[PDB]
Amino acid sequence: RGGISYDQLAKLSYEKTLRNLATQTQNSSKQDKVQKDTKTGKITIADDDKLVNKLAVSLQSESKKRYEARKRQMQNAKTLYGVESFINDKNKQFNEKLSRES
Amino acid sequence: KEMLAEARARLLNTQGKKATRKIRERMLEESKRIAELQKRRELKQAGINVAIKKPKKKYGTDIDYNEDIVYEQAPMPGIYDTSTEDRQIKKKFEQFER
Amino acid sequence: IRQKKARTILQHLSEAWRCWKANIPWDVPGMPAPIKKIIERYIKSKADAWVSAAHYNRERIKRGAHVEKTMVKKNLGRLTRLWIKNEQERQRQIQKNGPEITPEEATTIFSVMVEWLESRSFSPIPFPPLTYKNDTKILVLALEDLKDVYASKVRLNASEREELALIEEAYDNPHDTLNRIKKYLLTQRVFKPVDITMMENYQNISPVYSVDPLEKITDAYLDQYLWYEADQRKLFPNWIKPSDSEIPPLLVYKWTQGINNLSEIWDVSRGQSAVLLETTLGEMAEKIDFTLLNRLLRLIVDPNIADYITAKNNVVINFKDMSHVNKYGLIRGLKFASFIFQYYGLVIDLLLLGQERATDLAGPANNPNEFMQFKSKEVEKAHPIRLYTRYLDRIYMLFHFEEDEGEELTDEYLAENPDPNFENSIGYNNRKCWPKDSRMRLIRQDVNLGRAVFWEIQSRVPTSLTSIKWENAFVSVYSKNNPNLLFSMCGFEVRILPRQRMEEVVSNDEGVWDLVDERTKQRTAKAYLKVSEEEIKKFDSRIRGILMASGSTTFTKVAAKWNTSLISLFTYFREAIVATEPLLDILVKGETRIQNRVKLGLNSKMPTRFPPAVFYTPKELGGLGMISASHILIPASDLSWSKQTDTGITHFRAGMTHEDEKLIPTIFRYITTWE
Amino acid sequence: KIPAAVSNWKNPNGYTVALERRVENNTINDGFMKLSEALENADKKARQ
Amino acid sequence: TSHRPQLEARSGAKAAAYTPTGIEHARLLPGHTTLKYRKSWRKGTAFGRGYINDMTKSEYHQEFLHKHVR
Amino acid sequence: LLIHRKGLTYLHLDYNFNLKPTKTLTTKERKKSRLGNSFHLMRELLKM
Amino acid sequence: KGGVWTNVEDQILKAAVQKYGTHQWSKVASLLQKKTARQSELRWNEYLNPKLNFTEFSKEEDAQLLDLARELPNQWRTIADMMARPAQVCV
RNA sequence: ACAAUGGAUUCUGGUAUGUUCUAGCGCUUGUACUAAGUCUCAUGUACUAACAUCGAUUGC
């Protein structure tokens, strides 16, 4: 049991997004360079604007999905426990935090 | 029952004078801004355009944050030539303010 | 670990130090053992600074060397936590390691008291019945003694307004309040806790116990009843002091007479010698054991009351955070604590004297003696203990030896622990206030005879009852080499020369008692009187308490606090100031601090603005009404040679100076002396 | 893991924390036994 | 709130970029301007014939609280 | 000149170098106009 | 004048101790009219503390109480720490 | 046969503190009726002093 370290958590997050990129290519397949300017020193990479848009969309979708999966957790945990005496929400979140200690 | 109501009111109030005074002051400031904004909207309906006043400088080197990007730290220069990205971001920003 | 987790762990550091000051064990369930080890390392580190700052600042307050007014309240608040932490630790060492009295000691201690009271034919004090002829007068004397606290002060808190109401309910219903006390003595055995506080005295810190008011009435009734019924049944013999019949200056006067009255003490034609012993009994009340105490009180008291007294001592002692159960020691703040304390001292008085001599001093049961009287002179000549008296925890023994009885006594001491380098005169403590001629001469024969006297007396009392130590011992031997007999009674420092031991008989001033024999009616000794050094600092600390408590107090309250403390000095030590040069420098420096307080209320300490007319004119004429004791020429005489002998008054130092000369009177001319 | 700090003295946010989170194991030795037994045996000898 | 612990101390990084004032302090006045360089009556009675690392448990602490309380 | 640079025009410096206020001051003006030792020790030297 | 403890004053005292801890009783007794800070401190330590056990004694605890009351006669605050009971329960 | 003589005064003291007080334009769109001021005394109220208050004797 126990917790998962950050180097093991990062690999599992990297393994998970590779399966999201695998099925994204499978759902697409189901439906149907390097230039180095010598004067400036800058390196320009030419890439597809669709794959850059799909990168920007999927990060926003994962940002909203974790935002909504946490918002429902806020609305559920506020309306679970009311037995022990509280005063405000920061007291409830602290007295619940004492319960996970024991 | 009266002393129980008083004890119930006392146990459920945890703030203090300075915190409560600060809450009242913040509410007053928010109401003052909303009133001034409404006053400007009603005068804009009458054609007269009056600008929003700035909060006066409390000290000599006080900072207007809207006028200037403040202690700007530029992103370190990189080998990837972000030139067209800046054009698209400028176009989208000017589109937003339009 | 982030700024959040570093923020929460530092609250276990603050909580641990509050548990340390409370003497509460800090144990957090689930705390990691490396991190608990870190906090205890730094709480002990902070405690080493906190305790050492309490030791350093205490030594500054005693010297008077510029302590801030806040720090005096802070050093008081530190030591009372250190005293209770030392008190609570001492309680746990008895609870772990058992009682300090062994079963062999407590059997013999109990057997000595049964043997004594059987010879006295002592009838024990009964429980006070419903038909008791003195019950309404004992109750009024209790309530008037509780009421005398509150005639002085003006405003009362919620506890004190409760206390006056419970007396007024007892004045109006005298029969109903007796039935309440009679029920509390039969039944009540668990009592409300006691809030302790500590009074600052700038040299020491005295404890004060606060008992609940409803429980204080049944203690004050019991203390009147125990003390009235003991004197009727004659429990306490003549040596136990305070006597209820003589003031503490008269206790010095009779004891100094009653030495000289007894025969052949000053006769030193043979090798005969006289020894006077002074020892405090250490932690006498602190070492009272409750199981021995409840068993001892059943001898003299009906066991319903003997169970009340034992259970009343077993209560909770509360400071602010600190709280503990008094398992072992006696509480001196209770009302009947004085009856316990002298009865426990009577047990110690029978261990030193023994059964045979304590009958000789107290006399027979039917016709007992006076304080220092024997039924005949042959009873006196036997058993070299001549005069015994005991104050609170300070005993006073007079031993008159022959030369043969003296050499036997001092040989068996040197048999047990001799000295080859002759070092018994090093730790021998005598009076550094008297000159070197006048104090005890450190003769090898008399010093070893003095330590042999103390060695015999220390062995008679076990260390489980009282801690009788040589550093608290003062022994003065009178011999052919020592013409002086020195002792210290109730704050009075006394020196005695016989009439024949003087070189020439010179006339003396008020500081000298002339000691008369009863049958010749002739003055045959002179008693030389001085105030103790411990009492001089005690008065110097009272002047500090007048100034340090007065923040912005009016001018005439400072003058009235000066007067009530200068009168309490001079009316007690009447004729003893005159021989003391340190006290006269205290009186001058003390009175000019009171005058400077009036000069600090204004913004000028300039001498011309403040004549003696401002301070010393009476309040009816508009002045402060200050009583002076310091417009007096102070005797200054050759400090290099004043330590050697008594020079006499050869020169006068000026006492208080003023531009226009006024001879302000002093109350020593207005208070008639004790002799 | 560090437990949270609940103090008996200080409550800055004013949280209502349950009574068990806010707030010996030995016996007496034989010295207190042998003291009391000898005092009774000295007392019963004294009564007889 | 308003009574806080420190999360970090004030650094000398901030005072280094400021402009100086040049105000004359009394303890910065010249002093020590030259350095030094190295080259039968007994029978009747009843009873007849070291350092601890703890400031509170210390022997001096017991002698302290016995004399200063009394 | 120094008094008037500090804005303390409600303090009048006499020709005999006596420094007195010209009105009843506010507590904020008493905080501002509280000159130190080096002003007054200089001013008393000029009075001497 | 000394009042008795009703059930409303007990539950205010429980909620105040749960709010203020046990080392400030003049702040607990300010919620309760007619109770002093000493009275509310003592009511907690004798009756309302959940650490205290108001249970019947076992057959061993009865014989162990009779054993202590001869060892320590009669020292009921000391016996109550041995018994880990309140002292008025032990008497 | 004694000539012996220290001082000394300034500063830090319940309304503190805080806010707002655009007259003088920045180009384009959009003949509706008469009580003064200062000083002094008295009374009433509010705030305030982090002012003070119990020292002692009796005719049933």
Curated annotation (Swiss-Prot), chain C:
Where is the protein found, in the record's own terms?
Nucleus
Which residues lie within the region annotated Reverse transcriptase homology domain?
Answer: 112-602
Q: What is known of its domains?
A: The MPN (JAB/Mov34) domain has structural similarity with deubiquitinating enzymes, but lacks the residues that would bind the catalytic metal ion.
Role noted for this protein: Functions as a scaffold that mediates the ordered assembly of spliceosomal proteins and snRNAs. Required for association of BRR2 with the spliceosomal U5 snRNP, and the subsequent assembly of the U4/U6-U5 tri-snRNP complex. Functions as a scaffold that positions spliceosomal U2, U5 and U6 snRNAs at splice sites on pre-mRNA substrates, so that splicing can occur. Interacts with both the 5' and the 3' splice site, as well as the branch region. Has a role in branch site-3' splice site selection. Associates with the branch site-3' splice 3'-exon region. Also has a role in cell cycle.
What additional remark is attached to this entry?
Answer: Present with 468 molecules/cell in log phase SD medium.
Q: How does it assemble?
A: Component of the U4/U6-U5 tri-snRNP complex composed of the U4, U6 and U5 snRNAs and at least PRP3, PRP4, PRP6, PRP8, PRP18, PRP31, PRP38, SNU13, SNU23, SNU66, SNU114, SPP381, SMB1, SMD1, SMD2, SMD3, SMX2, SMX3, LSM2, LSM3, LSM4, LSM5, LSM6, LSM7, LSM8, BRR2 and DIB1.
Q: Which named protein is this?
A: Pre-mRNA-splicing factor 8
Q: To which species is this protein native?
A: Saccharomyces cerevisiae (strain ATCC 204508 / S288c)
Gene name per UniProt: PRP8
> Whole protein: which stretch is covered?
774 to 1448 of 2413
UniProtKB/Swiss-Prot annotation, chain D:
Query: Can you say where in the cell this protein is located?
Result: Nucleus
Report further notes: Present with 1670 molecules/cell in log phase SD medium.
Superkingdom to which the source organism belongs: Eukaryota
Q: What is this protein called?
A: Pre-mRNA-processing protein 45
Q: Which cysteines are joined by disulfide bonds?
A: none
Report the sequence similarity comment from the record: Belongs to the SNW family.
Relative to the complete UniProt sequence, the shown stretch is 164 to 217 of 379
Q: What does this protein do?
A: Involved in pre-mRNA splicing. Associated with the spliceosome throughout the splicing reactions, until after the second catalytic step.
Q: What do we know about how this protein assembles, alone or with others?
A: Belongs to the CWC complex (or CEF1-associated complex), a spliceosome sub-complex reminiscent of a late-stage spliceosome composed of the U2, U5 and U6 snRNAs and at least BUD13, BUD31, BRR2, CDC40, CEF1, CLF1, CUS1, CWC2, CWC15, CWC21, CWC22, CWC23, CWC24, CWC25, CWC27, ECM2, HSH155, IST3, ISY1, LEA1, MSL1, NTC20, PRP8, PRP9, PRP11, PRP19, PRP21, PRP22, PRP45, PRP46, SLU7, SMB1, SMD1, SMD2, SMD3, SMX2, SMX3, SNT309, SNU114, SPP2, SYF1, SYF2, RSE1 and YJU2. Interacts with CLF1, PRP22 and PRP46. Interacts with SPP382.
Curated annotation (Swiss-Prot), chain F:
Q: Which cysteines are joined by disulfide bonds?
A: none
Location in or out of the cell? Nucleus
Q: Organism's domain of life?
A: Eukaryota
What else does UniProt say about it?
Answer: Present with 468 molecules/cell in log phase SD medium.
Function, as annotated: Functions as a scaffold that mediates the ordered assembly of spliceosomal proteins and snRNAs. Required for association of BRR2 with the spliceosomal U5 snRNP, and the subsequent assembly of the U4/U6-U5 tri-snRNP complex. Functions as a scaffold that positions spliceosomal U2, U5 and U6 snRNAs at splice sites on pre-mRNA substrates, so that splicing can occur. Interacts with both the 5' and the 3' splice site, as well as the branch region. Has a role in branch site-3' splice site selection. Associates with the branch site-3' splice 3'-exon region. Also has a role in cell cycle.
How does it associate, per the subunit comment? Answer: Component of the U4/U6-U5 tri-snRNP complex composed of the U4, U6 and U5 snRNAs and at least PRP3, PRP4, PRP6, PRP8, PRP18, PRP31, PRP38, SNU13, SNU23, SNU66, SNU114, SPP381, SMB1, SMD1, SMD2, SMD3, SMX2, SMX3, LSM2, LSM3, LSM4, LSM5, LSM6, LSM7, LSM8, BRR2 and DIB1.
The free-text domain note is: The MPN (JAB/Mov34) domain has structural similarity with deubiquitinating enzymes, but lacks the residues that would bind the catalytic metal ion.
**Listed name of the protein:** Pre-mRNA-splicing factor 8
Organism of this sequence: Saccharomyces cerevisiae (strain ATCC 204508 / S288c)
The gene behind this protein is: PRP8
Please specify the portion of the entire protein covered by the chain, as first and last position out of its full length.
581 to 628 of 2413
UniProtKB/Swiss-Prot annotation, chain G:
Q: Which residue ranges carry the DNA-binding annotation?
A: 25-48, 76-91
Instruction: Quote the subcellular location field of this record.
Output: Cytoplasm; Nucleus
Q: What is the effect of changing residue 76 to G?
A: No effect. Slower growth and thermosensitivity. Complete loss of function. Complete loss of function
> In UniProt terms, what function does this protein have?
Involved in pre-mRNA splicing and cell cycle control. Required for the binding of the NTC complex (or PRP19-associated complex) components to the spliceosome to mediate conformational rearrangement or to stabilize the structure of the spliceosome after U4 snRNA dissociation, which leads to spliceosome maturation. Its absence leads to an arrest of the cell cycle, possibly due to the inefficient splicing of TUB1.
Source organism: Saccharomyces cerevisiae (strain ATCC 204508 / S288c)
- This chain belongs to the protein called Pre-mRNA-splicing factor CEF1
Q: Where is the HTH myb-type domain?
A: 1-52, 55-91
Which protein family is named in the record?
Belongs to the CEF1 family.
Instruction: Report where the shown chain sits in the full-length sequence: first residue, last residue, total length.
Output: 9 to 99 of 590
In its miscellaneous comment, the UniProt entry states: Present with 784 molecules/cell in log phase SD medium.
Subunit-structure text: Belongs to the NTC complex (or PRP19-associated complex), composed of at least CEF1, CLF1, ISY1, NTC20, SNT309, SYF1, SYF2, and PRP19.
